[PDB]
Design an enzyme around this catalytic site. Structure first.
Site, short mmCIF file in Angstrom:
data_model
loop_
_atom_site.label_atom_id
_atom_site.label_comp_id
_atom_site.label_asym_id
_atom_site.label_seq_id
_atom_site.Cartn_x
_atom_site.Cartn_y
_atom_site.Cartn_z
N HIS A 119 0.83 -1.22 0.00
CA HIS A 119 0.00 0.00 0.00
C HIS A 119 0.86 1.27 0.00
O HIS A 119 0.66 2.14 -0.83
CB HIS A 119 -0.94 -0.02 1.21
CG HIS A 119 -1.80 1.20 1.36
ND1 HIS A 119 -3.15 1.19 1.08
CD2 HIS A 119 -1.52 2.46 1.79
CE1 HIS A 119 -3.66 2.39 1.33
NE2 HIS A 119 -2.69 3.18 1.76
N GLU A 120 1.80 1.38 0.94
CA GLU A 120 2.61 2.59 1.04
C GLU A 120 3.43 2.85 -0.23
O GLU A 120 3.58 4.01 -0.66
CB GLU A 120 3.53 2.56 2.28
CG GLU A 120 2.79 2.63 3.61
CD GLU A 120 1.87 3.84 3.74
OE1 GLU A 120 2.27 4.96 3.37
OE2 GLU A 120 0.73 3.66 4.22
N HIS A 123 1.64 4.70 -2.84
CA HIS A 123 1.80 6.15 -2.63
C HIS A 123 3.16 6.64 -3.15
O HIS A 123 3.24 7.65 -3.85
CB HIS A 123 1.64 6.54 -1.16
CG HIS A 123 0.26 6.31 -0.60
ND1 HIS A 123 -0.89 6.64 -1.28
CD2 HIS A 123 -0.14 5.80 0.59
CE1 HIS A 123 -1.94 6.35 -0.53
NE2 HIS A 123 -1.51 5.83 0.61
N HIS A 129 -5.58 7.33 -2.61
CA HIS A 129 -6.53 6.31 -2.15
C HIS A 129 -7.63 6.04 -3.16
O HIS A 129 -8.01 6.92 -3.94
CB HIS A 129 -7.11 6.68 -0.78
CG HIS A 129 -6.11 6.56 0.33
ND1 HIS A 129 -5.96 7.52 1.30
CD2 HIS A 129 -5.19 5.61 0.60
CE1 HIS A 129 -5.00 7.16 2.13
NE2 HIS A 129 -4.51 6.01 1.72
O1 LIG Z 1 -6.45 -4.01 3.51
C1 LIG Z 1 -6.24 -4.00 2.31
N1 LIG Z 1 -6.08 -2.90 1.51
C2 LIG Z 1 -6.12 -1.61 2.12
C3 LIG Z 1 -4.94 -1.21 2.94
C4 LIG Z 1 -3.73 -1.89 3.03
C5 LIG Z 1 -2.73 -1.40 3.84
C6 LIG Z 1 -2.88 -0.24 4.57
C7 LIG Z 1 -4.09 0.42 4.46
O2 LIG Z 1 -4.45 1.59 5.11
C8 LIG Z 1 -3.37 2.24 5.73
C9 LIG Z 1 -3.97 3.49 6.36
S1 LIG Z 1 -4.43 4.70 5.08
C10 LIG Z 1 -2.84 5.40 4.82
N2 LIG Z 1 -2.15 5.98 5.85
C11 LIG Z 1 -1.04 6.36 5.27
N3 LIG Z 1 -1.07 6.02 3.96
N4 LIG Z 1 -2.21 5.40 3.63
C12 LIG Z 1 -5.09 -0.06 3.66
C13 LIG Z 1 -6.06 -5.28 1.58
N5 LIG Z 1 -5.98 -5.29 0.29
C14 LIG Z 1 -5.79 -6.54 -0.29
C15 LIG Z 1 -5.70 -6.63 -1.66
C16 LIG Z 1 -5.52 -7.86 -2.26
C17 LIG Z 1 -5.42 -9.01 -1.51
C18 LIG Z 1 -5.50 -8.92 -0.13
C19 LIG Z 1 -5.69 -7.69 0.45
C20 LIG Z 1 -5.78 -7.63 1.91
O3 LIG Z 1 -5.68 -8.65 2.58
N6 LIG Z 1 -5.97 -6.37 2.41
ZN LIG Z 2 -2.72 5.10 2.15
#
Ligand SMILES: O=C(NCc1cccc(OCCSc2nc[nH]n2)c1)c1nc2ccccc2c(=O)[nH]1
Ligand SMILES: [Zn+2]
Ligand SMILES: [Ca+2]
Ligand SMILES: [Ca+2]
Ligand SMILES: [Ca+2]
Ligand SMILES: [Zn+2]
Length: 167
Positions: A119-120, A123, A129
């Site tokens: 995820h990071e 970015h 998002h």
């Molecule tokens: O949770 C999932 N995706 C969303 C996510 C992930 C990490 C952090 C997140 O949010 C962090 C806080 S927001 C922020 N703060 C600062 N920067 N960004 C949100 C996910 N996707 C998948 C996709 C495919 C397969 C499995 C999965 C699974 O198992 N999970």
């Molecule tokens: Zn994020």
């Protein structure tokens, strides 16, 4: 002459990263594997290449810190904020910071480092998002339990960098 580009993105395909320090929670090898896997998520669907540097200045500087750690985005202790990353650009651009007051794991417990890192790095590469609740780039962490990058994220990253080799 040159004008500035239309979206925030890297202007090169060869990117470097550096793991500046390490969390107490996991072995060095576990952390390295997690980050390597996280970058592979994105290189698998673009022409981007990621090479690890052991020292010096990399495009994506990765570190673990707590509270005030050298920017305008101080961490907040256990829970709340967990990490943040800067969009593509110089100096801070691309860098990824993880809150070392959280519990980082290579499991379903605490926060899975691979998942948060993937995820990071989204970015770090220029994705904001998504509104798709199934997307990697959705703003709320959920551990669902073979990783496949969701189509919304594929479309997003390919809008910036192209698909690279499609097969
Ligand atoms: O949770 C999932 N995706 C969303 C996510 C992930 C990490 C952090 C997140 O949010 C962090 C806080 S927001 C922020 N703060 C600062 N920067 N960004 C949100 C996910 N996707 C998948 C996709 C495919 C397969 C499995 C999965 C699974 O198992 N999970
Ligand atoms: Zn994020
Ligand atoms: Ca926190
Ligand atoms: Ca940087
Ligand atoms: Ca910790
Ligand atoms: Zn920071």
């Amino acid at each position: 002459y040159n004008v500035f580009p239309r979206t925030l993105k890297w202007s090169k395909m060869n990117l470097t990263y550096r793991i500046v320090n390490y969390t107490p929670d996991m072995t060095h090898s576990e952390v390295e594997k997690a980050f390597k896997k996280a970058f592979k998520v994105w290189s698998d669907v673009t022409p981007l290449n990621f090479t690890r540097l052991h020292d010096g200045i990399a495009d994506i500087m990765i570190s673990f810190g707590i509270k005030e750690h050298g920017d305008f985005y101080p961490f907040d202790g256990p829970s709340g904020l967990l990490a943040h990353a800067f969009p593509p650009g110089p100096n801070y651009g691309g860098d990824a910071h993880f809150d070392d007051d959280e519990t980082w794991t290579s499991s379903s417990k605490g926060y899975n480092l691979f998942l948060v890192a993937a995820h990071e790095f989204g970015h770090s590469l220029g994705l904001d998002h998504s509104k798709d609740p199934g997307a990697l780039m959705f703003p709320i962490y959920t551990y669902t339990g073979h990783f496949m990058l969701p189509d919304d994220d594929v479309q997003g990253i390919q809008s910036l960098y192209g698909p690279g080799d499609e097969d």
